Symmetry: C3
Subunit: 243 residues, 3 copies
């Protein structure tokens, strides 16, 4: 007919994990689809952090976008649909204009199609705002652990990075020297020390299954950026202002 969006990923789990990385920060968001792929930018529910997702067209098995379109979606509903996909299902999203989007899983003997209504969301009015590379699971463990001591974590980087927290339980200091991964790589001129809200760092680490290395961009006075590479596809970035 005329005109359509259709994007096919080889593995549904990639999309399931992308949704896990944002669903607890955003109950709804808009996916902007264009020739170059899919992007999302939104303030979290509490309007503190900024979430920015980039998926490139060249990482899809099939990508067609006849005209630019934006799909406002309930992320909770989208998560429930992605829960229905098996381990080696692909996932196709199609939007006829739209009032709905369709999500399709295929493997073989099983074909599943799901149809979800589209919103209807306002444009966000946003501004998107140096670095240390280290294991994603180590960053996640450190943030989980230090949260036991305090709602704030001090990050102090030289060229090693130190994560600190203190409170009733006691005072904690975790020091990682510069060395699937265990490599800790640091790029710094002037040392930086900043304090961040643990509850937000811990939300960011829901992106952990997407990447074995995480990137922290931390200059003084300006938001930290936490970045997870999505293999052969793009990345998610979280922006968080220091205290």
């Amino acid at each position: 007919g005329d005109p359509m969006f259709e994007a096919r990923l080889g593995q549904a789990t990639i999309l399931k994990k992308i949704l896990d990385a944002i669903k607890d920060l955003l109950n709804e968001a808009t996916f902007d689809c264009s020739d170059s792929g899919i992007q999302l930018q939104a303030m979290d529910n509490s309007h503190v952090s900024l979430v920015s997702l980039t998926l490139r067209s060249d990482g899809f098995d099939k990508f067609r976008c006849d005209r630019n379109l934006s799909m406002g979606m309930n992320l909770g509903s989208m998560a429930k649909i992605l829960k229905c996909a098996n381990n080696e299902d692909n996932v196709t999203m199609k939007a006829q204009n739209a009032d709905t989007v369709t999500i399709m899983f295929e493997s073989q003997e099983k074909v599943s199609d799901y149809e979800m209504k589209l919103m209807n969301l306002d444009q966000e009015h946003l501004g998107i705002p140096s670095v240390v590379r280290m294991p994603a699971m180590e960053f996640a463990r450190i943030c989980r652990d230090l949260a036991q001591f305090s709602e704030s974590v001090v990050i102090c980087c030289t060229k090693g990075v130190k994560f600190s927290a203190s409170g009733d339980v006691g005072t904690a200091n975790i020091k990682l020297a510069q060395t699937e991964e265990e490599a800790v790589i640091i790029e710094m001129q002037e040392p930086v020390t900043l304090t961040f809200a643990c509850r937000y760092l811990n939300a960011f680490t829901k992106a952990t299954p997407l990447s074995t290395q995480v990137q922290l961009s931390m200059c003084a006075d300006v938001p930290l950026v936490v970045e997870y590479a999505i293999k052969d596809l793009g990345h998610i970035r979280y922006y968080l202002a220091p205290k």
Copy 2:
């Protein structure tokens, strides 16, 4: 003395799984013991579905039943006893007449005997009421998934079977083509489509560990029968009227 019931199964886990398959639908039921084995027929707690269990005498390692007897049992208490059995324990049920039944696990160095009071339940006054064979775990997954969308699931069979649900979250369609298992086998003359209450199908799937294939008998206007083969022993069947 005179006279006794004694039935011995090689693996207690078989009985643990049988109890898992009925305990959440029936808080109490009567086991009718005779020369041909053990049977159970009962309406569920809400008096909607019918549960019918058949165990043949020739599947027990030892089966003795001097006279017919019926044992009214608290299934919750029986479940707690079976929780006490290890992986390669056998299980012997003995009833002297009934006032009690005894349940015994043996392996070796460990012998456990449990004694439970018998009821005292009324006879049920029941009437027991074409088919598609498919993986039990697939049926269970499909029913769990579709329950996210609705309290009702439409089952539409041709010769593939389609499971559908729609609601606020969206609309879902799952289509399985005719092909430990993955085989989907269909026996139909006239196509049938019926709608069932998800909460009941999901209770039936507690029988899943007993069988890798499940059987659905579905003619128009009459109750669906969901059947799990219990290896070298018998079967459990659940009966559910369509909407």
Copy 3:
């Protein structure tokens, strides 16, 4: 400077498991440190059972204790610190006098130090009060299972040991004949039968990960002693009076 306590264990998990074994019985306790190692004796929160821990100096990779000292500690806070240790971290405890103690984990690229305030607890005023050796996991399973039937468990030992409980659910008897482990070894002159509170035995079995064999010392009229060997280091003992 002058003078210090410093004790280093090769594996932090040993200490994590020691804490698991006492934290639910004691919210705070005093560790008495001397030349011969570390000891702890305390009544539980309900003031029913007695917990007694012995760690020998010769089981530490490094042990220095310039003068005797006692460290009153919040066990819940100490547990939270030990949660921060990884699988092959060592653990060093240091006390300068304290007012605080420091706990340090090292592996390599990661160094963590934690600092916790010391109490300030009264001396306990205590008196420390035949035997059967058997698998720790079997003892734990038996106690968990029998708790379904009753708040009391009868232990009846000859030369096999029998564990019994009865109640609404039914009556239970578990008999272990004398034979990583499965060995059941019995040392008795006169047979003994005693009844114990299940909720306490079940608290004791939190020590299970420390030892594959457990020891029960049970003479008539006097407290049972339940003992778990801590490999190449010492033991924990729980004392419980019969009903």
